[PDB]
């Protein structure tokens, strides 16, 4: 079997478009996404056409194999689409009308700059190659773009699921390639974080500062070191969930600064213990009574900048 | 091979039935569960219509090839089901019975909102698409739905395996969707969860309140940070077991709310040795007295308020 | 191809072997096992007979698409079993040998009561399905019922691989269905245990115990939370091993009964302090001795106990 | 297709070889490595005999289904090998070249009794069953065996790829076995143990004996029960990457016997504090003057003793 | 089907290429990533030579199975590659051209000896073993050599996908083997190694040199061992993430010199206390003051020379 030979010298315009069934497993290491669809493909073909009358027929339903279709391939996943035809109607004016339900992994690059307030574009590149009888073009059928109602992403929002209309018609290996955009934007659901994360990192940090309010040098180290231990803690929880990034995160920028914190609390906690030793307790006082109003306010304003920086 | 043709102008009924034979990994995180069954379809083909006074046989047996079979497929699957055909048979007036044997990894939303002792209602969801000669309904043959006795799900009460007989049919696509809803009803097993995870999280935070029978600072601290700690652990090893949620869970919030009476114990600590190093013990000893009883009776009203909000 | 008809009414008999090649993965989280073995059919086809003198042969091979096969299967499997037929060979009165080996992941619940000195009976199940010419019934040939010697499942020792030779015939969806019960024994090698999780979380409480000997408050609150710390680890590491289960396990009560040893050397510890600070150390001299000799003997006691009530 | 007949009642021999391409994957836990290597297998058939002045060619090429092939299977796989034929070669006199790469996960078990200076004999055996018409019988082509000088397998040192040229001949189920041993020598890559696990563990133990150096039962008491608790997470970190064993490994036995030692220095620092406590701190000097000697000198004979009951 | 006859007595030259598509999955621990690309061939097959201006038709497009084709494969992969043929094209005077897409785990080693400021040749091997009619050899065509502007590595930074363009040809089994070396030039990004492990396990190493600044014994303890339990949870992280190497990795220096830094620590913290309790505190205080300087300054000088002998 051979493609479809031109009326006159026209590419041959294969109309696409992708329903989404499911959609799961997005992978925030991996930088991935499995998706579960229907893909619908359109184009005419002359040598199939049949007149209604003579035939009895209104339409022609024929096997993958009795029939020439375009190699139609993802560009941005891990292995071949795992699929089955669901159907092939063809009309009187030989438009063919093809059928599929796909599985896929698909790679993705995710932007983790604002974690875990942040937003993707996921994206689905659909591709055909040209032959040496005539050049290939994808269109897309945006009547056959769409999702299901209950597509749902764990821990994640979807906002909209469409498609960028002008493919990239562009060389590769010399042979003409056209390439479609299937854009699914979502939105990280940020609200388990705050109970789970940010409070009680924000909870062992507060208790440390209760050593602003003690004399007690053995209590003071046991307050900013246990803490401190905890705070480490919850970096590594933090990182395991992340993949390693050139840049700074929302959520990595706050954790690096509580380290400073931590740090400058323990050197306030040694410089009060030693005037103390040395007879000099007023000056240790205020040192002491001064940090109870810095800390909190440094904390407040360069939170307020880190906010300011990344939203 | 083409569907059996209408004898007046009426949907071709294809009746179902699913015999659960294992259940296994039921996968929190993911949303997932893997199911091994039994599939059962029956449908009238009048084109097989058969004499059994001639044919002298009673039944006839036919390969998958050989005739017609209705495309059915699971809506909420990862991949396509792994499925083998036991049976084919054709009774003399046509009507055909299918029997294949099928295992597949479903996707089925779980709440969360009352764990470790919440139910779930998983779905597996039967779907058929209309062709162009003639549209394709689905049917529920209670005779044909159940599971075996030997059926378990680790760290579940499997309840009851039914199906909703009535099918969603809706157009997707310029095409009729016939859709069945058969759904299998679990209990969580939350006994574990007593002496693993609530029980020892009660015992470290009531060691925390014997800090309001010592006027040592020292051991206070050491009383509560150590505590404190062991809490962030057990904190850390619930959110492992769990996805991340739009909402609080029932476990979820009793591990938040523990956080705050760590830090109030931290300030009743802090508080009594200020007044102590300031010569007003009389004072610590009201606030030390009070918080005896103020802290186990505010922790036992917050339970059966949270209780109350979430059964 | 169609099953071999009755000379009278009887069921065809199916005989049955399962020869052991491999054992491996024992999961107990998930209670699969992996196994890899040599499946051998035997039964009685008439068509197939021929006279030796004539033929010119003793025996017969054939390809299994050539001649009509039972649809054997196993209960208990996650998918399919992955097999490869190695011979089917025909004796000139009909009789059919197949062998074929296989492997398969099969589901067999644990009962973790007596854990880590805990047995099991694996159980794979073979199953056949009667069809609408004949009733297909299975037997056991005790001959080809086997293992290999070097047969070794990691942290196990294998005492058995017998056969139930009566199978459970029973009705399921209107078809006479044949299974047997092949089962392996095993019995957990528990050593590892002892100088791993046993030994160290005794140590740890034995040296909570020391508390008895020590007036300091402090040094008492360091030595006894920092153990329970410790104890919550192993606690953790052992759940990690084990599914949730409805029901106590050996080690779960142990480590379960060490937390209230803790809970109660924390109120010695308190009580012994807080009489001391009210000028009553005679007394708490009283408590602290009597707690010397009660704490062991109570745990000696409650041990004794915990294995007469699971052993 | 059937075997080659015999000219005289001999066994047909099936001449083998691998040679090894890549080793991957030796996982400890599981008793399991990857290998990618190419399988040769070498028959007479001599129905298979060609004159090259009739056919032109001096070597036939044949595809795996148009010729007898000898079914050989690897024994010790978990599932059986993924594989791809290469080459069949058949010259003049019927001698068949069989030439196929493979990919397997081999089951073979391990001895850590010395780990992590242990070494191991992974085997691959090859094995062929008997047919009706004809025993077949394995052999060794030893200029087929062997191994690409780029082979490397992480964590190892590989020493040797050799057969054991005699196969075992022996019956099963009633007909004739030939199994192959090949054998794969390897040597673990102890260097990263020495500065990751056994030089911190020195460390820490040796930080608790400066205990013996002071006269603090506090920080005596801080001292001993931190680093015992460092010592539970190297003894943890270290039994995850070890199968559960029915002995002691080397490792796992100085593990232990650190436990003993920090048990000791618990009672030596609970004595020396009570007796300071009761008056007699002169008695106290002596058992603390002692320790600083009996310690180290205890711990040097006990791994003398070790090493040589290991070594 | 049969290899190309040679004119004369030349090699068969098969022209390659590889064209990557995605690279993800660089698993530093099993020394593999994946990749996705297109695989293209050439050869001169002039049993398929046309004339253009008879035939009409100027390319003839034909299926895999219609004509002879390399047996080409990868040396360095788990199993063989998923391959799916897009294009086989021959022009009048037999050239062929051939385009495959596959995905495929490549197994390549890695020198971790300056991680995390590492940099990798990852290695994709292609080969080819003659046949008996004639030899094969590979060649590169460099116009079909390169990668897609949008590849990303995870974690990496590519630099250069280039080929070696002269094979090592060398016999194997007594055939000729043609092999070819694309090299994936990849640079390791070390951004987030600073914020998340090198800052944070500096911050607590000059913690615990606070202990310089005070007098108190039983502070200092907390101090130092407090802060040695943290660099174990960070040496732990660290090793977790890389394989086990028989030479020292950069990262891994340090964090082993810095155990000897905490281990120098504690004696000092030692040597001042029983200076102290013998009544020469003057002693003691020219010991701690000098390590003030000490410590910070042969920390400086060891990690120049550390840094010095790795790069
Ligand atoms: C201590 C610091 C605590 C973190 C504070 C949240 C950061 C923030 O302000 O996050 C902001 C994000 C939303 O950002 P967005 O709408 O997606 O940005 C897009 C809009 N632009 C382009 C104009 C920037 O979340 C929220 O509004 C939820 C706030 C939850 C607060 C929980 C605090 C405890
Ligand atoms: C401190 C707080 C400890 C947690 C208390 C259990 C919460 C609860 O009361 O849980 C209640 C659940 C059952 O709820 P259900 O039947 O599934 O709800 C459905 C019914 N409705 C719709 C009317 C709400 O478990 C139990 O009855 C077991 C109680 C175990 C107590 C263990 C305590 C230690
Ligand atoms: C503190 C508590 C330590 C645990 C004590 C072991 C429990 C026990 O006694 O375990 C008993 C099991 C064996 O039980 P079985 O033969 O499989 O039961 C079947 C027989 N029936 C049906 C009659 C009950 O192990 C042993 O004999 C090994 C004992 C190892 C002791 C290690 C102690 C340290
Ligand atoms: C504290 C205890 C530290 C452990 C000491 C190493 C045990 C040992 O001596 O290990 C010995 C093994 C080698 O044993 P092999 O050659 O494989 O035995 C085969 C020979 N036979 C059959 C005669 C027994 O490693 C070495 O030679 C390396 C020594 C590294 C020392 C690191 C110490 C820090
Ligand atoms: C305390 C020690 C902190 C570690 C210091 C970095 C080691 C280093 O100097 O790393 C050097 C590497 C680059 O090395 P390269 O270009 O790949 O080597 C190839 C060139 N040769 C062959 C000539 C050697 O990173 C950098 O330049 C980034 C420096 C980051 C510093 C972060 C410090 C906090
Ligand atoms: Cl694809
Ligand atoms: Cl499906
Ligand atoms: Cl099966
Ligand atoms: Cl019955
Ligand atoms: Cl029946
Ligand atoms: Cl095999
Ligand atoms: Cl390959
Ligand atoms: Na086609
Ligand atoms: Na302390
Ligand atoms: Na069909
Ligand atoms: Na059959
Ligand atoms: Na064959
Ligand atoms: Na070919």
């Known amino acids: 079997v051979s493609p ?16 989404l069934i499911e959609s799961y497993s997005l992978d925030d290491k991996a930088e991935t996404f ?20 003579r035939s009895g027929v209104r339409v022609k339903t024929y096997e993958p194999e ?3 279709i375009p190699e139609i ?21 030989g438009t063919v009308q093809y059928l599929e339900r796909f599985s896929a992994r698909v790679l993705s690059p995710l932007d983790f700059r604002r974690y875990p307030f942040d937003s993707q574009t996921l994206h ?52 003409l390639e056209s390439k479609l955009d299937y854009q699914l934007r979502i939105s990280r659901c940020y609200f388990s974080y705050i109970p789970n994360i940010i409070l009680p990192m924000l909870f062992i940090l507060f208790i440390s500062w209760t050593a602003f309010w003690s004399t007690s040098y053995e209590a003071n ?25 050139p840049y700074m995160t929302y959520t990595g920028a706050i954790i690096f600064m509580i380290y400073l914190f931590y740090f400058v609390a323990v050197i306030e906690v040694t410089v009060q213990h030693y005037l103390k ?7 240790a006082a205020s040192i002491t009574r001064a940090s109870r109003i810095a800390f909190p306010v440094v904390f407040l304003l360069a939170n307020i900048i880190l906010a300011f920086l990344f939203f």
């Open 4 to 19: 479809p030979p031109p009326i006159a010298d026209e590419p041959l315009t294969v109309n696409t478009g992708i329903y």
């Open 73 to 93: 391939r993802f560009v941005n996943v891990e292995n071949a689409r795992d699929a089955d035809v669901v159907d092939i109607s063809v009309s009187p004016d």
């Open 124 to 175: 689905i590149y659909l591709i055909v190659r040209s032959v040496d009888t005539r050049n290939i073009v994808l269109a897309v059928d945006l009547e056959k773009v769409g999702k299901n109602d209950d597509v749902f992403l764990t821990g994640w929002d979807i906002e909209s699921f469409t498609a960028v209309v002008k493919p990239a018609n562009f060389a590769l290996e010399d042979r």
């Open 34 to 53: 499995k998706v579960n669809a229907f893909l619908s493909l359109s184009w005419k073909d002359r040598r199939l056409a049949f007149d209604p009358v």
């Open 277 to 283: 030793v040395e007879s000099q307790p007023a000056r």
């Open 66 to 68: 009795a029939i020439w």
């Open 221 to 245: 180290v046991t307050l900013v070191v246990s803490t401190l231990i905890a705070h480490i803690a919850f970096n590594i929880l933090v990182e395991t969930n992340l993949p390693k990034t």
